[PDB]
Amino acid sequence: INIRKTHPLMKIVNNAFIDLPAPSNISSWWNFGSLLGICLILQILTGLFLAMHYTPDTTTAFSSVTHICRDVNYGWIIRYMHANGASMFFICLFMHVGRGLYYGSYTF
Amino acid sequence: INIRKTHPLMKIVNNAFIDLPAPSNISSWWNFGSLLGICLILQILTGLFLAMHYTPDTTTAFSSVTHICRDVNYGWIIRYMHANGASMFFICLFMHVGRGLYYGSYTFLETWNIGVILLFATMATAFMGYVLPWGQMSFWGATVITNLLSAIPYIGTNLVEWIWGGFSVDKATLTRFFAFHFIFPFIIAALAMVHLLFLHETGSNNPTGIPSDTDKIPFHPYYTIKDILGAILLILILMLLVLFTPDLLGDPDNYTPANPLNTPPHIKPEWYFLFAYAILRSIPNKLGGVLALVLSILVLVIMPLLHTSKQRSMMFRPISQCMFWILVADLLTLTWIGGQPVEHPYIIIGQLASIMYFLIILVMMPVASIIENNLLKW
Amino acid sequence: KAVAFQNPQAHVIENLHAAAYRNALANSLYCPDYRIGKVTPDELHDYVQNHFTSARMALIGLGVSHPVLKQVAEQFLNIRAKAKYRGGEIREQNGDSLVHAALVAESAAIGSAEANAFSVLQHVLGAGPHVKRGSNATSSLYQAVAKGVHQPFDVSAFNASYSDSGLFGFYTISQAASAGDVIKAAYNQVKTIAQGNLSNPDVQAAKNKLKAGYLMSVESSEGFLDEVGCQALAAGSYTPPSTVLQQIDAVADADVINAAKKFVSGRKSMAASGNLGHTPFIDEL
Amino acid sequence: KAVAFQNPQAHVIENLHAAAYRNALANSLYCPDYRIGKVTPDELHDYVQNHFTSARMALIGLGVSHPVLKQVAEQFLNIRGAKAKYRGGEIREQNGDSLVHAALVAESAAIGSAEANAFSVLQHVLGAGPHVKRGSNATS
Amino acid sequence: PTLTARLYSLLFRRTSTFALTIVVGALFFERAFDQGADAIYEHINEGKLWKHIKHKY
Amino acid sequence: ATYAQALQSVPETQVSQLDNGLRVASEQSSQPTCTVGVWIDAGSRYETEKNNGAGYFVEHLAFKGTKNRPGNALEKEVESMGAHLNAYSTREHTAYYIKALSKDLPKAVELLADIVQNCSLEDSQIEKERDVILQELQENDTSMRDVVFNYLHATAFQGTPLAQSVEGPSENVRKLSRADLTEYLSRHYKAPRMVLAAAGGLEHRQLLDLAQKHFSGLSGTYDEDAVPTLTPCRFTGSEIRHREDGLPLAHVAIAVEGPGWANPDNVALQVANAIIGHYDCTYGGGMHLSSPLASVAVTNKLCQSFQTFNICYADTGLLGAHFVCDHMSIDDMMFVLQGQWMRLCTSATESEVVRGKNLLRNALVSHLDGTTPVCEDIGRSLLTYGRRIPLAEWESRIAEVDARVVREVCSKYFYDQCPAVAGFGPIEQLPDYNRIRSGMFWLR
Amino acid sequence: HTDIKVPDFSDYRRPEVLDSTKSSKESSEARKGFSYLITATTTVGVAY
Amino acid sequence: KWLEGIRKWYYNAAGFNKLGLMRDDTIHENDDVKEAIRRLPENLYNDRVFRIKRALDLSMRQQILPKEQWTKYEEDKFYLEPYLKEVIRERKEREEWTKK
Numbered sequence A: 001i002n003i004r005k006t007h008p009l010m011k012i013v014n015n016a017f018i019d020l021p022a023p024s025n026i027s028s029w030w031n032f033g034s035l036l037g038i039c040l041i042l043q044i045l046t047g048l049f050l051a052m053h054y055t056p057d058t059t060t061a062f063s064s065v066t067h068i069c070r071d072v073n074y075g076w077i078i079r080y081m082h083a084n085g086a087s088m089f090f091i092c093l094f095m096h097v098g099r100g101l102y103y104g105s106y107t108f
Numbered sequence B: 001i002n003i004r005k006t007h008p009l010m011k012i013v014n015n016a017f018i019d020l021p022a023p024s025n026i027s028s029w030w031n032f033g034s035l036l037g038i039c040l041i042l043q044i045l046t047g048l049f050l051a052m053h054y055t056p057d058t059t060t061a062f063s064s065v066t067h068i069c070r071d072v073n074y075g076w077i078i079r080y081m082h083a084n085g086a087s088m089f090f091i092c093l094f095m096h097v098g099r100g101l102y103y104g105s106y107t108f109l110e111t112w113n114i115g116v117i118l119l120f121a122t123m124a125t126a127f128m129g130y131v132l133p134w135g136q137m138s139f140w141g142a143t144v145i146t147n148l149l150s151a152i153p154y155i156g157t158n159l160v161e162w163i164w165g166g167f168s169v170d171k172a173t174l175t176r177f178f179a180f181h182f183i184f185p186f187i188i189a190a191l192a193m194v195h196l197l198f199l200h201e202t203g204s205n206n207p208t209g210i211p212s213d214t215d216k217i218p219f220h221p222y223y224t225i226k227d228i229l230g231a232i233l234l235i236l237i238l239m240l241l242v243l244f245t246p247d248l249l250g251d252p253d254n255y256t257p258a259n260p261l262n263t264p265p266h267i268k269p270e271w272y273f274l275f276a277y278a279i280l281r282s283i284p285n286k287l288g289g290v291l292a293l294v295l296s297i298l299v300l301v302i303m304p305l306l307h308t309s310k311q312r313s314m315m316f317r318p319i320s321q322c323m324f325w326i327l328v329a330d331l332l333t334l335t336w337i338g339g340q341p342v343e344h345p346y347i348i349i350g351q352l353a354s355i356m357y358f359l360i361i362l363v364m365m366p367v368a369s370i371i372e373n374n375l376l377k378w
Numbered sequence C: 001k002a003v004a005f006q007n008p009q010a011h012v013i014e015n016l017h018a019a020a021y022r023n024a025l026a027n028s029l030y031c032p033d034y035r036i037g038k039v040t041p042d043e044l045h046d047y048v049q050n051h052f053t054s055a056r057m058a059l060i061g062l063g064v065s066h067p068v069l070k071q072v073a074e075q076f077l078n079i080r081a082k083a084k085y086r087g088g089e090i091r092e093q094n095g096d097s098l099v100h101a102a103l104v105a106e107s108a109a110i111g112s113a114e115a116n117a118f119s120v121l122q123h124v125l126g127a128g129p130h131v132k133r134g135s136n137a138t139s140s141l142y143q144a145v146a147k148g149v150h151q152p153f154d155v156s157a158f159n160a161s162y163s164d165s166g167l168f169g170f171y172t173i174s175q176a177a178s179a180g181d182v183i184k185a186a187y188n189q190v191k192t193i194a195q196g197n198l199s200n201p202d203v204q205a206a207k208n209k210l211k212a213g214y215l216m217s218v219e220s221s222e223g224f225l226d227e228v229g230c231q232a233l234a235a236g237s238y239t240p241p242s243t244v245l246q247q248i249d250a251v252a253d254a255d256v257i258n259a260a261k262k263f264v265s266g267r268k269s270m271a272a273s274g275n276l277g278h279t280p281f282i283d284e285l
Numbered sequence D: 001k002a003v004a005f006q007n008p009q010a011h012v013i014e015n016l017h018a019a020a021y022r023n024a025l026a027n028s029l030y031c032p033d034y035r036i037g038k039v040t041p042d043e044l045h046d047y048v049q050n051h052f053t054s055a056r057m058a059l060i061g062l063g064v065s066h067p068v069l070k071q072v073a074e075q076f077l078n079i080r081g082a083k084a085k086y087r088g089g090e091i092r093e094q095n096g097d098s099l100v101h102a103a104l105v106a107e108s109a110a111i112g113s114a115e116a117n118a119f120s121v122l123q124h125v126l127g128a129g130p131h132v133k134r135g136s137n138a139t140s
Numbered sequence E: 001p002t003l004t005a006r007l008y009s010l011l012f013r014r015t016s017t018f019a020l021t022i023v024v025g026a027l028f029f030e031r032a033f034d035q036g037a038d039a040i041y042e043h044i045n046e047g048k049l050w051k052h053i054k055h056k057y
Numbered sequence F: 001a002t003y004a005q006a007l008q009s010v011p012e013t014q015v016s017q018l019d020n021g022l023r024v025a026s027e028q029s030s031q032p033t034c035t036v037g038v039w040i041d042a043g044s045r046y047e048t049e050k051n052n053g054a055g056y057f058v059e060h061l062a063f064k065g066t067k068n069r070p071g072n073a074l075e076k077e078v079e080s081m082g083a084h085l086n087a088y089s090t091r092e093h094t095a096y097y098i099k100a101l102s103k104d105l106p107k108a109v110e111l112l113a114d115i116v117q118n119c120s121l122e123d124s125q126i127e128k129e130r131d132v133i134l135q136e137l138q139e140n141d142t143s144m145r146d147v148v149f150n151y152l153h154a155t156a157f158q159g160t161p162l163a164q165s166v167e168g169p170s171e172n173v174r175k176l177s178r179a180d181l182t183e184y185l186s187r188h189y190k191a192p193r194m195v196l197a198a199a200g201g202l203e204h205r206q207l208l209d210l211a212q213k214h215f216s217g218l219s220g221t222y223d224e225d226a227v228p229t230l231t232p233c234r235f236t237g238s239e240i241r242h243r244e245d246g247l248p249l250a251h252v253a254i255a256v257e258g259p260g261w262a263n264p265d266n267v268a269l270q271v272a273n274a275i276i277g278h279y280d281c282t283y284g285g286g287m288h289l290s291s292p293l294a295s296v297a298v299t300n301k302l303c304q305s306f307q308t309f310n311i312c313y314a315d316t317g318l319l320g321a322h323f324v325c326d327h328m329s330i331d332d333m334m335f336v337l338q339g340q341w342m343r344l345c346t347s348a349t350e351s352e353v354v355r356g357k358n359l360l361r362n363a364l365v366s367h368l369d370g371t372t373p374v375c376e377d378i379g380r381s382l383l384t385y386g387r388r389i390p391l392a393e394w395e396s397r398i399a400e401v402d403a404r405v406v407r408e409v410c411s412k413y414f415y416d417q418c419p420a421v422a423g424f425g426p427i428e429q430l431p432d433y434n435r436i437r438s439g440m441f442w443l444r
Numbered sequence G: 001h002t003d004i005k006v007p008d009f010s011d012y013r014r015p016e017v018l019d020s021t022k023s024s025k026e027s028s029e030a031r032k033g034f035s036y037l038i039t040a041t042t043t044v045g046v047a048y
Numbered sequence H: 001k002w003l004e005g006i007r008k009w010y011y012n013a014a015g016f017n018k019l020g021l022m023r024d025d026t027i028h029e030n031d032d033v034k035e036a037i038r039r040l041p042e043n044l045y046n047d048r049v050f051r052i053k054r055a056l057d058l059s060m061r062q063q064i065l066p067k068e069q070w071t072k073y074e075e076d077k078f079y080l081e082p083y084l085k086e087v088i089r090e091r092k093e094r095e096e097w098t099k100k
């Protein structure tokens, strides 16, 4: 019949992402799960590129970060994207905890 | 009723480690799943300590590794655990593959394909880690395999100046390989979970190849103590290797610093990649060599599409059994020829060993299989 | 079996046939409740062996030619129990608040002036109604019980005819606490028709209704196929429908009154199902 | 009901008392097939209120004293159908269990009288349950 | 309203046609949008960029 | 053999017209049984807001006497000639037929004229019919298939009078009087729109002359205002779901855009619904049927039954699929149903089209078997098409339909249209409507 | 169940549909083209 | 012919007469073989699962049967082959009906 209900990975993908019974009156505060997840994959990806251009040595660590920001193509956009994505990550995290405390989700 | 059969974590642990129905027949060759798992988490832990004491730059990498093996407490045993654990990891990986190919467990399709993707991932990870110590052999291994990626026309040279991090093996190459070696085993762990998921979907095998639906025994506490026994045997082999002869497998030519001018005479991999290097230099053609290597591991992809027999195992087929042992001796011959210089008898029998490898797999398995299908009146 | 017996009528007719005969006609078209899953195929093989022989086979072809069918029957078909009457009842407390009651005496076998008299008698007493959503101003039993009881109900005659015996009676669909009045009123009406109080134009209307029923059972080729095959299998000669109508209107109401007397004076049998707190047993009838 | 009618004897005796009376003795010990689930507490209140009266009750004590029972039933109770006709008939069951059970039963007597005592004498003349285990029943 | 009927009938009935449509639109829109934003950023300063003063130098 | 020559010897429909615009239609064959009926274009579509429940009510009052023969003498004489009298009425047409013997024709036609043009109205009769029709409303509530088709028309033709039910609602029936029925009969059962159709053992000059004696003088003098003329009704496309979890099975119907009557797209869609068509849970040979939906539904025990079918109304209709399935297999059944529609519309092979043509030939010949369904076809054909189209023309239109034109027409009508979905029962596992519309077209 | 008619959404309908006397076929093409036009332009921007 | 001598030596040295198995206890199971196993009489099916359970037991202990209980080539009661041929013929007939 359906690959989406018989394949062993796609059973998990179907039961978590498509055929999930969700309530019908979500307001915008129920976005912050996806916002924290997409911030997480963005921070991991930009961080992995930063970790490809970084040298952890206390003589040349700050010079390596300056080398990232000045000399590498768009490395300044990746560095500022990582830092400001961390700040937006904690913004979305405190919105998430505020939702979870205010709407009484702490009975779980 | 019970804690275990209702809780959402312990249902996963119950269908993995406690009440998984496993067959009552599997020999010691079905221990290398758990041995690869324990080697993988041991690599992750000991490598994490090495990465806490390591500075990835082409000026100070070799100096920092020497600082680990002299000045930091027990850095020498943790570094030797990491290197010889890579060696024992590929021993148990090739024994795992040899089991899965000999006992007809390649009739599974999706588990086998995710297996081959795991083989690609572990080989690329171990090569990047072998580049990391920044010795002479690591420098020239990185150079030659990156030019092997440059062998392909219309894609190659731009791709290779792209992953060079410049125009040669510069600082950026060492940092790139540090980052990818330092991330790829987590992807290997996730695909190992996917591998194990498709296995627990289908169900395991046994040395007869007969489906064992009548005689499943639970995993705990029979195979758990069997895998503890296998783990103790593996740790004693690994630890005797790191405490008595740590140099018996490693390269002597690593320990010089990276001079980009010398090019030593006896250039070679670490011993697990000899047959990949032996198929390469036994074909006098660039694209032919790299394509024949990729076609070797794609032949391992091909192997489920040639199961034209009607038993499952090779326990009951003696002709294919003898041909499989010819295949094993031929792969060990390729490893030995790769671990040698290149002269006239070595050239001839390297070419003959690669030819006989492809002839055994792509021709001799179905011919032995069709003599089996003819001979027992089927 | 579940899909077939979701109706009540199948239950009541099968309990009727299971109650009237002590013998081979008591068996049902459908499998019983406990024989499901517990029948070997060897019984099917032995049944096909000692019943599917060429002494018992009528082969009918509509639209096709004769000699092709003859040559096929030559090239392929070369391959070669006095039902006693019991009396009594089957009563089944079911609980749908619609009492179904079938009251049946033994009548006659097929192929007789007596059998045609019973067919005329079921057309006197009323069949499946003609004018749809009508009032049935001609069927005698409905007139008698609508004179009696002011409820929704239905009364229908019932003439099953087989090659050895036959079952004549009627069939009542009534409410819960109204069943006995309907059955007794219908029984009184059948008794006063068996008395002899049946005029001439009612019997002429019954002859016209039987002529209409027989000639309208052969509109479609399904029913015509079944008619030709069953009659050729009965004796071995298809008698045309015009002389069948001749044998229908040959009879007179003396045979009709004799048939009704033979109904009333015989030993009754019944099958009832539903909410049966008021259905009279035998002696109250 | 399932555990009760895994014995054939119960189903034979219930068809027996259904086939020999048109009336109040033809009520089963057990609830039938279709009434399971469709009996409500309204009928429970009705049946309790008009079949549990203070004249239809015998309080019997074994090991207790009479004045204690007199106190109990004097303090704490304080609350306040149709005869069965013979019918005659038969009920058969096609069950295929390779043991034909058959009860042949006629109307004999009401309780209390020497007529019923004479029928008890008659059943012990004819034959009862086996007095000797694994015996031959040569008195029956 | 008729101008969208043939648009639906030619570029949205299929799926592969829809994909080819958005790919060709992506390339054409990339070119036109880069030229437009370059014109906007030149217009918004007109006296400060390296380009015009370097061809004056 | 000689199937073309077998279709040339199919008898011909004699069509003629009386001076009131009456359409008389005799089919003379060689049987001793005849069927005579009146077909009228007067249904539950022409009604007003408060005329709802008029065709049903007049059908239930047409058999209860008249001003010529009182009370029940009509029933008495029809059973005195042994005829079966029947009537029906849908949203589009209304018929009264009589199944009788051949030599009992002219008195039957006289009674038929007294059915049509003299249906008087009695007040005890109108109380009786009000009571009986309320009983029939409450008992047709408990059926399921009629509830599903009424819900389907109600959610498919919103506002437009095609969504008026044939029974009408409860409150437009429990207050009707003689005035509404009087204007109903004065406006709808007119003479230039009714068809006398008679098939069986009767000639044409005989029937024509009897109609000239009796039907001539009926009507044709239509009154001054409100002449009935249709409006092209709007197929909205929506869903209605009656969630009622105290039921064993679930009923789902889904239908798309209307083919109509005159266009040969009707023929192409009947080929497509001969390909998919029907299944019931009580067939033999479950695992091996030709319909792939039947193959999957027996292989995985999805549904009890379905019929994928057509309904055509005047210049509109529904291309439909009704399936009856248990409350744990609704999503999968819906998925395979849309999979079969799109397998027709994307990659239709030749063999299935040939199978559909043969099954539709046998369906048409089996439906035109016996005089009463063939006279039924003649009545509905002289109303809808304006002529009974003969079987040689049906064979030409079938044989001139091949696989390419089938996938063209089916991609015109199935592919990416807005459905009407009616659901009744335990249908919480039915997919939401946007997943249904997303399943109408598959991107691959 | 006969009294189950819709409460109509004549406030919510697009102006090509709103007449209860016109057909609903010829006002379908432009409507689907408009919605799929919006989806196509969004897909172009995201791919860019 | 000597090829029968090859077949007898091969059935001796093949290793599945050692564990008390007959010819059709070692068949690999795709969908067709699963169908042919489901199409069996009851006594042969119970004898089959018993021989299979003894084979898994004897390979668990890695002990091979005494001389007096090896299955012999002269009494080779191969039984699963007719049902398996019928499955293959009906499957190929269905495949050809789909192809044309």
Ligand code: HEM
Pocket (backbone or CB within 6 Å): A040, A043, A044, A045, A047, A048, A050, A051, A054, A065, A079, A082, A083, A085, A086, A087, A089
């Ligand atoms: C595993 C993935 C990650 C890697 C490889 C990574 C790598 C790095 C590296 C190399 C730096 C130093 C570069 C720099 O600061 O200019 C850095 C900085 C930083 N990272 Fe990450 N990071 C990862 C994930 C995260 C996550 C999940 C967060 C939290 C949201 C985070 C928050 C930060 C912050 C706040 C800084 C300091 C930025 C600054 O002030 O310049 N990182 N990361």
Ligand code: HEM
Pocket (backbone or CB within 6 Å): B029, B030, B031, B032, B033, B034, B036, B037, B040, B093, B096, B097, B100, B105, B106, B108, B111, B112, B113, B114, B115, B116, B118, B119, B122, B188, B192, B195, B196, B199, B203, B204, B205, B206
């Ligand atoms: C990344 C390294 C790998 C790990 C950690 C790994 C892990 C495992 C584990 C834990 C099992 C279950 C235990 C067992 O059956 O032995 C397993 C089974 C299996 N693996 Fe892998 N595997 C790896 C690589 C491979 C490769 C390269 C292949 C070959 C393509 C492969 C093929 C199989 C097969 C066929 C089985 C089933 C064996 C059986 O049921 O008897 N695996 N693997």
Ligand code: HEM
Pocket (backbone or CB within 6 Å): B043, B044, B045, B046, B047, B048, B050, B051, B054, B065, B079, B082, B083, B085, B086, B087, B089, B090, B125, B126, B129, B130, B131, B132, B133, B181, B182, B183, B184, B185, B186
């Ligand atoms: C994510 C987990 C891992 C980490 C954190 C890690 C970390 C490191 C570090 C820091 C080094 C440099 C130290 C040295 O060269 O001796 C290294 C080298 C190496 N790693 Fe890994 N590693 C990991 C996984 C693996 C795996 C899975 C393998 C393959 C089995 C592997 C094989 C090697 C090899 C062969 C070397 C070179 C050793 C030498 O020549 O001394 N590593 N790894």
